[PDB]
Structure formats: C-alpha cells, structure tokens
Amino acid sequence: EDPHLRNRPGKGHNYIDGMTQEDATCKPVTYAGACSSFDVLLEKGKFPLFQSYAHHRTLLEAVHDTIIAKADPPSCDLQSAHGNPCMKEKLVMKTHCPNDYQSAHYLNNDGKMASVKCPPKYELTEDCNFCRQMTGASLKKGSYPLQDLFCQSSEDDGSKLKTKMKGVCEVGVQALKKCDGQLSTAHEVVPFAVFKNSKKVYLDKLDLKTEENLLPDSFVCFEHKELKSFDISQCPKIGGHGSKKCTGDAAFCSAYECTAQYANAYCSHANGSGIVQIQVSGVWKKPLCVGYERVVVKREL
Amino acid sequence: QVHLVESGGGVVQPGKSLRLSCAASGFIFNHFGIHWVRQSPGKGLEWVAVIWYDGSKKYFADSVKGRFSISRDNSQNTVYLQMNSLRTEDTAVYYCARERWSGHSYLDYWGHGALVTVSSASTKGPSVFPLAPSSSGGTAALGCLVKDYFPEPVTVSWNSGALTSGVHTFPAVLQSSGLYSLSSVVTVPSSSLGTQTYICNVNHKPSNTKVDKKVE
Amino acid sequence: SNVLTQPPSVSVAPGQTARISCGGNNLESKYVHWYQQKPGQAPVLVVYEDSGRPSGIPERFSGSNSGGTATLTISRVEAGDEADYYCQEWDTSSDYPVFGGGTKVTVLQPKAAPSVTLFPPSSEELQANKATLVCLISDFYPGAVTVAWKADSSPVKAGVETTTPSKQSNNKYAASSYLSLTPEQWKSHRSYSCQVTHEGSTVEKTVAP
C-alpha cells in the first residue's frame, strides 16, 4: 500500500564506492529505474525490519549521508592469498548471497561499512565467502547488503555503551568473558545497534520505539514529470520563502505554505518516520543504526 | 523503440562555430549518458565527448579540449554539442550514441550521423559543360561535366529527370582547390542520337544555382 | 596509455568462420566490446562485455576475451557482413574509453576488368581558356584501379585528380579522374590518353583535337 518506498531520505544513494556503473538509477534511488543495491530490500519478507522502517536510511544511504564512516580498507579482496582483514568478521556470519553480485557490504565491529569484493568478471559464491568465474548472466553493477538494518542521524554519545548478553561467551567476533567449560554453539539471528563513539552492541532482545515529528525527513515529496522525487528544501515554510511552490496534507500545511492549484509538488507524511530509539541495558538511547545479522553464538551450558 | 535523430550538421568555415543537436526517443533521458563519436572521411571511429545521465560529469577528447562544450535538456530530451573554433580536421560524420551504464560501459544505440564539413572554401555554384560523343556496338555515350562547386550536394538530373534510365552520376573530386567536380554520363542507342536532344539539369542548393545545359 | 590493436584487414571465404583479434594490456581484466559499421552507415554494437550478444545478432557472431587477447568469431560468413569492425575498452581508471584502429573485413568475389570512357574538352570550355579531360571508370572488382594519363606518348605530371572507388548498385565499383590543361597544352599535342590498371591490365583510351 505504500507507493513511496523509493522516495528516499538523505542522498537516496544506494551504490558502493568503486561500483558507479548504475549511478543513473542508484545515485539517487528514485521512483523510476532499478537499482541492484536497493531493490532486494523491498522483496516481501526478505528484509522485514527495513520493510517496517523503509522510510529510514539504508546502510549505503547512511554511508553517503556521512552518518556512518567507511571502514579502512573499504573493500576486502576475496581472491587474495591471506584473504582480507574482513575475513574474521565475515566468516562468523552465516549469509546467503543471490547470484550475479560482485560486491557485498556490511556494518563492521567498529560501526563502519566494510565490504567483500571480487575481481573483474568474478562473482561472489552463494555463501558470500569466495569468488568464482561463472559463464552465465552479466554481473550486477552494485553491492548486496549483508545485514537487515536501518539508520538515522544521532548526536547521542554511546562511548560508555557495551554489549551485555546473559550467558554468552562468544557472539560473532565478540568474546564476552572467560569460559573454560564446555560450550554450545549455534548460528543465531542477533539484533545489534551502532551509536556515535560506540562499537557494535549486540543485544539479547530488540525493543524499539518511534517518536514521530515534522522534520524534513518525516516527509516524502513528489512532482509530476512519470513521478519524480522532489527536494522538500525548496518548499517555503509558513512565513518564509523558497524556489518552488508546494502543497500537501494537514501535517505538511501546518509548517509549510500550501498553494493548492499552483503548487509544483505534493508532500506527505512518511509512514513510520520519526526518531527510532532503542533500549539497551534498560535505558533508551538514540542509535546511529539498528539491525539484525546471523552470527555464531557460543553459550555456557 | 529507441531513436536518435541528429541535426545541426552543416557546412562551415574554419574558426567559426556549429551546434550539433541530438534528440532522443524510446527511453528515459535521465537514465543514460550520451556520447559524441566522430568518424573522419574514411578513417576510424573517434570518441569526442560524453555527458552523464545527469550532466554532472562531462568529458571531452583532448583534440577538442576546451574548444568544445556539451549540454543536455530533459524538457526537450536533447543533447547540444557546441563546437567553437572549428578546425579542418574536425570535418567528420558525428554520431550521438546512448551509453548503457553510467560509466565505463558500451554504446548500445547510435544516431544516423550529422555531416560537419569544416572546409575553408566558399559557397559557389557549379559550371556545366557538354561532353559530346565523337567517333560499343550500336550504343554511344554522352553527358555533362560539372566543375568547381562547393559544397556538396549537387544533383544532376536529365531532362527533368526523365532520362534517369542508363544514367550514372560519378562521384565528385575535391581538387587542391577544395572544390567538387562531378560528371553525369548517359548511354543511348546510336540509332537515337539524332532526333532526340539531351539537356541535363544541375542544381546546387547552398549556392542557389540551377542550370539546364544542352549537349552538342 | 591504454591502446587497442587490431589487424588492419582480414579476408575470408563465405561460409567459413573468420576471427578478428584485439590486443592490449590487461584485456583479461578489462571489458572489451565490438561494433560493426557497414559503409555509409552508423556503427551498430554487436559485442558487449566480452561475451555478450545484443538483441538482433545471430548465432553466427560470438565474442571472447582470453589469455590477454579479445576475439570476434563469425561462422557461416555471409557476403552482407563485409564491413569495419572496431573493438573498444573502457577501463575504470580511464575517464573515457579507447577505440581500436579498426579491422576492415571483406568477403572473398567476381573479378571483372574495368570499363573506361574518356571525354575531351568542349567548345564552351576551350573558348574560355580552360581545358579539361574526363575519365570515367566503372564495373571493376576489386576496386584497385590506379590511373595514369599520357600526352603524345609522354607522361603527364600535373592536373590529375582521382576519386577512390565507390560501390555501385551492381555491387561493383566506380571511379573517375580529371585532367586540367590550358588550350595551348591541349592543341599542341597530337593526342591524349588515359590508363586504368586493375591487376597490371593497362586499359587505355585516347582522344585528340
């Protein structure tokens, strides 16, 4: 029922650096066109958290909006001998890559975007762990998102926030405490969040809340060309000026001038938009990003 | 159905300018970059320019670095290639071509080609002369010679084009003077060279010169 | 910099496959494409992203890039494939692509001696202190037709302009040559002559005042 999932907050840029050959439909993502780094996120049921918060930013959008920094290095070469510095983080993730991707990206332990990358004419294997030369379809021009997540800006300092999980010895690459006894091992889907000045915080339970507002990213605006994405910053506030004429719903017209039959664009409140906060060791905090990933977890017996 | 229609290609003198226009249909103008690749007379292809799907990146060839500019309009689905300070070697058939992917990709659709002739000659009409047959079976051959015209094209029909049968107009030659000179030959049975006369009609459009000349 | 090298020309008999090469650094890594331009027409893309078949290209055509060399293979060669073939790479480091020089492929072929017709000046032209002789040549396959004029069995070395061949409506080729003189150089000589050579065959025509 939501027709505006492609009208993106931020840059709406769903490409990874070094793969710019689909910039026409990924830079920015908009109503028209296909974008191999973004469209998979909208496949019903594949990315349920993002699809519940689809007017918030993707990982690539948050990277290009300068909310999340890129890891150093920003891509790992899977063909190499020693492998790549990402290998430890990647191997503890259980992932399924569709065919025909050359690249895949994830939010690493430092809260930065890392990626695994194949050479020219090489594709990722199905487990996302190796590269291979298959004689088949052309490769996609973008990068596959490895985690189900969404992002937003935040100034809330998380420098004192740390993973705390009852009875866990290891989760992904995080060893939580000494355990010299016998352990049980499983792949688990674990929620996590990243905060300003924090590392990745894995969590035992996901408890989220959303505060709606009338900030610019709480709206999606479109004009008629075919639909076209429109920059809300052009719309005059009540009592102010702009470069375009706009109109919209009651929430929009509470803050912006609405010119009805002369407007160049229509703006409406984005389902689910607002500040999402997350509960972490009993306290509500404003994260940079929230997501799920599937990682090895070892627990005390 | 993607169509690339080009125009603005004309005959101009060195030092002056031209503006090539490429209209595009059958696709989304916003999702594809547009290139300009010129081919010199009988030489190889040469990429000249590219404008991105959004116009943020505009790359030029080093032979026209600075002298050429590019622009595009979404409201018109059009690409303009402005060529200031044209040189003689710029004379070429220019093709606007869509590029599939935004960068480092292949050109999937090409235009018909706009002829840009950058010669220093002047727009001058031809001079017609009768090439008469003299002493093949029972068939002779006559015609008319067209001399010192610029630029192409010159159309030489025969008696209001009523004799097109067995008539060949041979390609003009560009002397060291830069002018074109062609011939129009017609074969006719020797038993018919007496009664019927043969007047060829030479027409040169840029010089606005039309002449109906007789042969012997 | 990055340069693509193709054979200057390749010829093949009909039905038999023909192979065109394209050379350069790191062709294994880079993506190589191929365009087919028939004379007087726009280049049509026929190979994209090494192996890659555009919509409307028969099975007879195939592209590849191996060992560091790109190759275009054409099986069951039809005569309607006589054309120029250009390879092209666009490396990520290069902000603009690179076209190869261009292979020029001809099908192999009804040989036929040329046909020459030489016309002397006219009265209208000579009355204005101008002399011109015309030599029209047609119906020769292949198009190799070097032309040499003559004057009273003496070689001329000025005033001659020759057009390179051009395909006619009969799949053959035609050309022309124009000799420029003054009337004093047209009447002072017994005769004038024109020669065309297809394969050493010095076909000669003659005129006189």
Author numbering:
A (entry chain A): 154 to 378, 393 to 468
B (entry chain H): 1 to 9, 11 to 30, 35 to 59, 62 to 72, 74 to 143, 147 to 227
C (entry chain L): 1 to 9, 11 to 29, 36 to 57, 65 to 72, 74 to 80, 83 to 125, 127 to 227
The paper states:
We structurally analyze and characterize the binding mode of a prototypical potent Gn domain-A-binding antibody that blocks attachment and of an antibody that inhibits infection by abrogating the fusion process as previously determined.
The Fab region of RVFV-268 was crystallized in complex with RVFV GnH, (residues 154−469) and the structure was solved to 3.5-Å resolution. One complex of RVFV Gn was observed in the asymmetric unit of the unit cell. Consistent with previous epitope mapping studies, the RVFV-268 epitope maps to amino acid residues located in domain A of RVFV GnH. Interestingly, RVFV-268 exhibits a relatively large degree of somatic mutations from its putative germline precursor, relative to mAbs R12, R13, and R15. The structure of RVFV-268 in complex with GnH reveals how antibodies encoded by the V3 lambda gene can acquire affinity to the GnH surface. To identify the mode of RVFV-268 recognition in the context of the higher-order assembly of RVFV Gn−Gc glycoproteins, we overlayed the RVFV GnH−RVFV-268 structure onto a cryoEM-derived Gn−Gc assembly model.
